[PDB]
């Protein structure tokens, strides 16, 4: 699902931060 | 400032969805 | 799902702003 | 700012979760 892939992105970009 | 990077990156990976 | 409640509100948000 | 309003929304709606 389009869904599930922009909240693992936002999850990656925040460890990230 | 963190935010305006996060929101970037949101942008980024709106488009590419 | 709590992932999909964020997803609805960030929309609304959205649509809001 | 609306980037600004946007990431207060998001972290509202985190704390709320």
New interface residues.
């Given amino acids: 699902a389009?869904?599930?892939?922009?909240?693992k992105?936002?999850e990656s970009?925040?460890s990230f931060?």
Same sequence: chains 1, 2, 3, 4.
């Fill in positions: 389009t869904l599930e892939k922009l909240m992105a936002f970009l925040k931060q």
